[model samples]
Target: TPFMSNMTGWTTVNGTWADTIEGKQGRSDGDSFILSSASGSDFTYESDITIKDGNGRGAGALMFRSDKDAKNGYLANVDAKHDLVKFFKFENGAASVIAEYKTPIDVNKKYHLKTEAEGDRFKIYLDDRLVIDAHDSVFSEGQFGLNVWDATAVFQNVTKESLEH
Candidate 1:
């Protein structure tokens, strides 16, 4: 089952208070995906998400390349309509679709999303599909967060593998 429209740990774009993990918010949104740690060393995370009622749509992706700021970070854009998975920049109160994916995908089923970040190179995976392979020197490493569009979805078997250098 997916979250309804009322829960904790959730806040709306309309400045509403949400404390549960439920509901589908979108487009005209001031809400966002959250992570436990905003910045760290090296991190690789994988999520198996099942999209129902089209849950993972709008600003949803493996949130990495993020800083301590509440609304500033780098996220790989995922959707079935893209030429491929693309890289996006969200920060400084501005958001834009910076990079376009070379391959197109349609997420009408379950898929695997994995991301690994170190130094400047960022790699994202959709199952075995390579979505975005980007390089940037601005952000090193940040938190690991999950994103959702305006659909109902469920995430399970999360694997956050940590490597020590």
Candidate 2:
């Protein structure tokens, strides 16, 4: 479903969030995210992310299997500072990188980000090309959301669909 239409079932875990004409705009100096009440175990989440300039390491991410406090989950993010796509797992607020791939991510350029979560396998795609393939069983089910770190980002055309076993 489109998340930017309005903030109905979404809960802002951290950072400043607003529904703008562009999409759901999120800004923060640190880690920030807004979680949808919609929960799923196995699903495919997709969105178009545009990273605006920031002081620190600017990044945008798609979060899945996240707790209500957003302390635990999986994140597939694109880093503007390092020009890389990274897959990470969060456990009790501690983040550990699972996989990373260098890519050309320019500021103000919109990129399509997608993630497929099935069982313990998670796949990340940038512009429809599979980039990071990872597996982790730390989280089995939780909420899904949009995340930004040390940057202002806009997320558009957000959609989440269940993956049939």
Candidate 3:
């Protein structure tokens, strides 16, 4: 079967992944992710997401190498409200920004965001431009997914591919 929707952790309405009734309260918003079928140590993950309510926190995110319950992983967030691209390390359900870039992002606009992870190195690209680059060998290998915070966003065409070492 093709990966259509994961209504438990994330409720997919149509072709978009959105809404997390509970923001993984016990853990952190960072734990709010829809995991994939495969796992990889070095790969590039991409998704097209639109911020529905960009007025608040928890914009849509791309998660990589996350644990079973999203206890640990790497996150790349994109939204119009924050007007920034941030890369973070999720440890113990908490996220800490390792790199961030300030740029104007318009609401109701779709964005093509991507994250490339290789070992301890990570890079985030917004619209095909490098925006955030950092290193954190926290979690070397895990599942990848699309994460939703307290806020809502529409996610589509999510993909992950192994990169050349």
Candidate 4:
């Protein structure tokens, strides 16, 4: 079943989000997010992302351990302009970078991004390759979602699985 068809447990924290044939399409400037009501602490979240544009620098992110309003949590995002994948922690709506890896990210290309968060440890994978491994203890458990910053993107095949720990 297409998840978008039943957005019963999803909430938009920012930006304009829609369920399209391609996937969950989001467009916004600055920061835009769509968060899931299902919450978890130790789990794996994966999604296929396609960044359409961002005026020059485009970015699409997967958010985990996020609050109900998405004001606080962890996120791993692909930055097209800088060709980097970055990890950040959001506290009271402010974001602080925790880790980053330099990798080519081209617009209009679909990339499989996955994040595994267990306790304070976080591992981010891009195209099935482990690109970031970091740790932070600020958030232990919360919701998961998708985000776009100053860009337009489509997210598909989003899945979340709880860890056995």
Q: Give the per-residue lDDT of model 3 (tens digit) for 1-165.
A: 133333223422112333343222111233246666567799888877666653254467887787777668888988556787878877896778888899887656788898888878888889899987788867888777666665566666667788877
Two-way lDDT contest, 1 vs 3, winner = 3
The lDDT per prediction is 0.53, 0.88, 0.68, 0.87
Model 2 TM: 0.94
Error of 2 at 58 (Å): 0.6
Top candidate (lDDT): 2
Show how many residue pairs clash in every candidate, following the order shown: 15, 0, 0, 0
Q: After superposition, how far is residue 114 of candidate 4 from its true place, in Å?
A: 0.4
Ranking by TM-score: 2, 4, 3, 1
How well does candidate 1 score on lDDT at residue 12?
Answer: 34
TM-score of each: 0.66, 0.94, 0.78, 0.93
Compared with the true structure, what per-residue lDDT tens digits does model 1 show for residues 38-63?
Answer: 34556676665544444334334555
| Pairs of residues clashing in candidate 4 | none
In candidate 1, position 48 carries an lDDT of 59
Where in model 3 is the C-alpha error above 4 Å?
A: 1-31, 54-57
Clashing pairs in 3: none
lDDT of 3: 0.68
